[PDB]
């Protein structure tokens, strides 16, 4: 049976179309999405949740974000720029980047597609554990703006993972397919996909004529997501602790981490409630930190960030030489699209048009990929 795989910069998802339905396959830990992480230890190689769980213990040898290096040259501006923010080493091997790590007591380096093949092997094994059957066919998605080298490098990762890559399709196209925007009535439909998830922000405008897809334009921010919004809440609470106790917890990494984890959870709570409460005993110097934050405040702390997402929207309508009024469907993918203030800035930019979002935004792309996988199988 063929599956659909969403290879994300930080999380991946795999789905399967069975019995006329799509099933997003949970991994060994019960998660419907798996971290795109690979860790090398003195004894073993970990992939997925196991890899992410030990990042704090082995930062320099736990790789993620391979999707940012895949199919690129070392001297690529993105590479040079991104590596300044990674704990692991990126090296140059004849103009091609490789991640360098310590593995089993030795220094080893891997090409981006090798790292991604390791992640693809996990998604393959995840589907087989669920299906109790072998998996070799699959549709893997990539960003609408990926070029030949990048597309081929992804195909290659699939191959190395022993997968038969039926096709490499664009992520926004997969999201459109999931909602079935390619089977609707009328003719030439203009669709905008708002993708804010996994640490990247991508806007894509597509035209669908008799089921055929054409990407009219792409815009976004390659380093924007939930972690930036969480950080603003953390900034909020650090200041508040300073006001109430005249103590700065910012240099105690464990206090900051407990706070950050609490804020990530409160953020999720503020997507379905107007206020979230946090109780953290002995946070810093024995001081208990019991507090709460409203949805309103959360939004004020991220005002510039949330508003900024419209920059790429208008730019996409710009290069698609279309008017906001000419967009027929709006689709939300990515976890952050669950944030109501994001849904408003959007829905009202398009003066009231209802948005497509009944499908779990973290799984829409894999979902659409599963549909396509079956039809192509």
């Amino acid at each position: 049976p063929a599956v659909g795989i969403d290879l994300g910069t930080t999380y991946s998802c795999v789905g399967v179309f069975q019995h006329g339905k799509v099933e997003i396959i949970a991994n060994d830990q019960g998660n419907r999405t798996t971290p795109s992480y690979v860790a090398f230890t003195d004894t073993e190689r970990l992939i997925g949740d196991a890899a992410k769980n030990q990042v704090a213990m082995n930062p320099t040898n736990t790789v993620f974000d391979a999707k940012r290096l895949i199919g690129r040259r070392f001297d690529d501006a993105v590479v040079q720029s991104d590596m300044k923010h990674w704990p692991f080493m990126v090296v140059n091997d004849a103009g091609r980047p490789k991640v360098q790590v310590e593995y089993k007591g030795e220094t080893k380096s891997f090409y981006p597609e090798e790292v991604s093949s390791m992640v693809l092997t996990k998604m393959k094994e995840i589907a087989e554990a669920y299906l109790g059957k072998t998996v070799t066919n699959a549709v893997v998605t990539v960003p609408a703006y990926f070029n030949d080298s990048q597309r081929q490098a992804t195909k290659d990762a699939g191959t190395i993972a022993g997968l038969n890559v039926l096709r490499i399709i664009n992520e926004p196209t997969a999201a459109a397919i999931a909602y079935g925007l390619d089977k609707k009535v009328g003719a030439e439909r203009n669709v905008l996909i708002f993708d804010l998830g996994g640490g990247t922000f991508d806007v894509s405008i597509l035209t669908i004529e008799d089921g055929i897809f054409e990407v009219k334009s792409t815009a976004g921010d390659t380093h924007l997501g939930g972690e930036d919004f969480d950080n603003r809440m953390v900034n909020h609470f650090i200041a508040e602790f300073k006001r109430k106790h005249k103590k700065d917890i910012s240099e105690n990494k464990r206090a900051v981490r407990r706070l950050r984890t609490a804020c990530e959870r409160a953020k999720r709570t503020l997507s379905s409630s107007t206020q979230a409460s946090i109780e953290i005993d002995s946070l810093y110097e024995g001081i208990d930190f019991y507090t709460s934050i409203t949805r309103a405040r959360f939004e004020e702390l991220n005002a510039d960030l949330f508003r900024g997402t419209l920059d790429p929207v208008e730019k996409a309508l710009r290069d698609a030489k279309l008017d906001k009024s000419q967009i027929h469907d709006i689709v939300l993918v990515g976890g952050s699209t669950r944030i109501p203030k994001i849904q408003k800035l959007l829905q009202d930019f398009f003066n009231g048009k209802e948005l497509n979002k009944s499908i779990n935004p973290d799984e829409a792309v894999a979902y659409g990929a599963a549909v396509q996988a079956a039809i192509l199988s």
């Binding site: 769980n53 704090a56 213990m57 082995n58 981490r257 609490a262 109780e279 005993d281 208990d288």
Partner: protein, 112 residues
């Protein structure tokens, strides 16, 4: 005014308490191995090497305690659940004291 709702919270804490006991055992096992190495016949250099070799385990113990704190931090206990609140405080303090011992171990291996 003891309520059945607080029992549900006290059970969560008891499971967390048990988890902490398990991590604490590993810390003790780790401590015996530490003293065993210090007491060993290994040459000062392979010794320093077996010690720093214990780095991975102390970091794993620290990480497990941190995950417990993060789990305790998801609880919301009303002011009237006094027993639950006291149990939570006691557990956090015990974990923090274990963390301090882990840090003392990190100070004796791989130099300091």
């Amino acid at each position: 005014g003891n309520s059945p709702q607080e029992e549900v919270e006290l059970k969560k804490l008891k499971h967390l308490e048990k988890s902490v006991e398990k991590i604490a055992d590993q810390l003790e096992e780790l401590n015996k191995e530490l003293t065993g190495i210090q007491q060993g016949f290994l040459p000062k250099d392979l010794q320093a090497e077996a010690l720093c070799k214990l780095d991975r385990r102390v970091k794993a113990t620290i990480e497990q305690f941190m995950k417990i704190l993060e789990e305790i931090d998801t609880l919301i206990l009303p002011e009237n659940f006094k027993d639950s609140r006291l149990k939570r405080k006691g557990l956090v303090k015990k974990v923090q004291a274990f963390l301090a011992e882990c840090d003392t171990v990190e100070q004796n291996i791989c130099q300091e």
